[PDB]
Amino acid sequence: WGNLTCPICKGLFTAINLGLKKEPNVARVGSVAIKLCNLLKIAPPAVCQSIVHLFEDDMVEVWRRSVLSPSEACGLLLGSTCGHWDIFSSWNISLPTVPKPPPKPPSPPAPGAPVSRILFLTDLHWDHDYLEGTDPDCADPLCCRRGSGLPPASRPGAGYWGEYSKCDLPLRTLESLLSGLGPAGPFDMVYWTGDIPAHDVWHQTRQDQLRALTTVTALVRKFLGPVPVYPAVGNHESTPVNSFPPPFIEGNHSSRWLYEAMAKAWEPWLPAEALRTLRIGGFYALSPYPGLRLISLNMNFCSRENFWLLINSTDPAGQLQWLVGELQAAEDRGDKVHIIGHIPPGHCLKSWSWNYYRIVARYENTLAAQFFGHTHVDEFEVFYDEETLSRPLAVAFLAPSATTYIGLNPGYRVYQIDGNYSGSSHVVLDHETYILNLTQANIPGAIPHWQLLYRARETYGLPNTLPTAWHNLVYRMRGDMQLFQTFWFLYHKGHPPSEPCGTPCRLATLCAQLSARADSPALCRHLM
Ligand SMILES: *[C@@H]1O[C@H](CO)[C@@H](O[C@@H]2O[C@H](CO)[C@@H](O[C@@H]3O[C@H](CO)[C@@H](O)[C@H](O)[C@@H]3O)[C@H](O)[C@H]2NC(C)=O)[C@H](O)[C@H]1NC(C)=O
Ligand SMILES: *[C@@H]1O[C@H](CO)[C@@H](O[C@@H]2O[C@H](CO)[C@@H](O)[C@H](O)[C@H]2NC(C)=O)[C@H](O)[C@H]1NC(C)=O
Ligand SMILES: *[C@@H]1O[C@H](CO)[C@@H](O)[C@H](O)[C@H]1NC(C)=O
Ligand SMILES: *[C@@H]1O[C@H](CO)[C@@H](O)[C@H](O)[C@H]1NC(C)=O
Ligand SMILES: *[C@@H]1O[C@H](CO)[C@@H](O)[C@H](O)[C@H]1NC(C)=O
Ligand SMILES: [Zn+2]
Ligand SMILES: [Zn+2]
């Protein structure tokens, strides 16, 4: 008799559920996973053990509530008649019935119009345990630190200011960054888009994450003084890394410990309005200038690595629907909008990325600039119209990281933006990138000098930095290897790998520049 298959399936996963609520069973799950982690040589056995113990609690809870949930598992196994499998099912937010205005590019600024200067910091990745002289090529996922051991005699230990390896930064190198800003300023505001702790993800307590938050926050406030700083939340701020339960998780395993600390650390910078949304889901909007609205998104709700989204990936925290409300209100007032975030939209989950793309196309006249980080290299994402995928209408700048991780010079970014006056377009006009050349900074007894690496319009011959200029740059680089090599050099903050980037590497790199929407290979149809 097959009329009983659904009842026994539900009985199995119901009993599975209550078994996995008991911590001796959770520990047993961990032990097997540690044993497999060691067999497949993912990491040294100390790291295998540490990372599984850190992850196992929230991970088993999520699986219990999603994949192993009776209505889900039995939906998958036995079809819609028994349950309903909807893990990562597709979803859509709703645009308002206001008609889209005719597409209108930004006006060229009048001669002598005000220019706003924005400092951009991202992926600082302070490593409290950074240790000069240790092995840069140790067996762990992060080196140059306490516990990395010592290098072989043939190779130098980690340099004093950092190293070209899988290493993060000592605090003094961030202090040095902030202390050298004078020539690059003055700044009207700072956009600070996330990733304060380092990549020592196998052992990160809530307290070391908070000490990363509070130490680096106080360091930037000391060097930037009264200049406003607008943070965005990176994927490394939480513990375990990428763990960002949406607001429907209450209780202690939620992100309240993190967002509330951010609200107290960033109170000098954000108005009360902003601090309220920051406590709920780590995003907010404010008004830097009359006529300009800034929106700081928590991209961890789009993230492929945010395992909590297995429970429910549909617009987590209602953030995209909230974003639509702000963009519409901005369109109604004639405001322009800056968006800042950490993970770039092209790297998000499919549904989230497709909805964001739709929002950007709809509000192309109102959105004036987009700024992201997370990849640590210097690149960008072009957005196109939904109807034909061929009219460029927005561009996201992905700034490179202050951290070395992996193999790079430290760097940061400055934007010139159409400034503070009525009728301003508020679009990026040009940008510059500064690096510390570790090859010369790590000379014993040298004092670090942060150097201008390049300015965008001058090295690429751009007449402006509107979306069409970046579209055009990609197709120029398709046919001009020398120009692509310049881009590849700068992509790595002046320290490119020694293995040549040949024809497939180039095409893949160029494709990423046009891929502002995930899982959309048609965007690259003119490259391959
Ligand atoms: C995952 O979370 C999303 C929202 O975060 C859930 O979607 C929500 O589901 C409810 C239940 O169907 C929807 O409510 C319905 O509203 C319609 C119209 O507003 C109304 O006709 C019905 O009476 C019902 O109340 C709600 O609209 C929907 N929200 C969104 C944004 O889609 C979803 O169900 C969750 N999935 C799981 C598996 O928990
Ligand atoms: C709330 O949940 C967190 C999640 O782990 C608990 O954190 C740990 O607390 C113990 C107690 O000192 C530490 O030894 C661990 O290192 C902590 N883990 C992390 C990742 O920081 C916390 O104890 C819980 N608190 C309450 C009141 O339930
Ligand atoms: C048992 O399954 C058969 C097959 O569909 C169905 O015709 C029958 O009505 C079911 N019996 C009950 C009591 O639901
Ligand atoms: C921007 O301009 C407005 C209106 O002229 C002024 O009130 C405000 O103080 C200005 N802010 C900055 C940072 O220049
Ligand atoms: C960094 O310093 C080394 C040491 O002289 C130099 O050869 C190299 O060209 C420099 N690169 C950049 C991008 O400054
Ligand atoms: Zn990072
Ligand atoms: Zn990141």
Numbering used by the authors: 84 to 611
Any passages from the paper?
ASMD is a result of mutations in acid sphingomyelinase (ASM, E.C. 3.1.4.12), which hydrolyzes sphingomyelin to ceramide and phosphocholine. The structure includes an N-terminal saposin domain (residues 84–167), a proline-rich linker (168–195), a catalytic metallophosphatase domain (196–538), and a helical C-terminal domain (539–611). The substrate binding cleft in ASM is created by the catalytic domain in the middle, and saposin domain and C-terminal domain at two opposite sides. Zinc ions are prerequisites for activity of both forms.
Full-length human ASM was expressed from HEK293S N-acetylglucosaminyl transferase I-deficient (Gnt1−) cells with Man5 type glycans. Purified protein was crystallized at pH 5.5. Therefore, the holoenzyme structure was determined using single-wavelength anomalous diffraction (SAD) from a Pt derivative at 2.43 Å, and the phases was extended to 2.25 Å using a Zn-SAD data set. The final model was refined to Rfree of 0.203. Clear electron density allowed us to build all residues from W84 to M611 as well as two zinc ions, six N-linked glycans, and eight disulfides. Two neighbouring zinc ions are identified in the center of the cleft. The two zinc ions are separated by 3.5 Å and referred to as Zn1 and Zn2. D278 bridges between Zn1 and Zn2 at the axial positions, while H457 and H459 are in the other axial positions. The precise side-chain arrangement around the metals facilitates recruitment of a key catalytic water molecule to the third equatorial position bridging between Zn1 and Zn2. The catalytic water is stabilized and positioned by hydrogen bonds to the main chain carbonyl of H457.There is an asymmetric arrangement in which the carboxylate oxygen of D278 is slightly closer to Zn2 (D-Zn1 2.5 Å, D-Zn2 1.9 Å), while the catalytic water is closer to Zn1 (Wat-Zn1 1.9 Å, Wat-Zn2 2.6 Å).
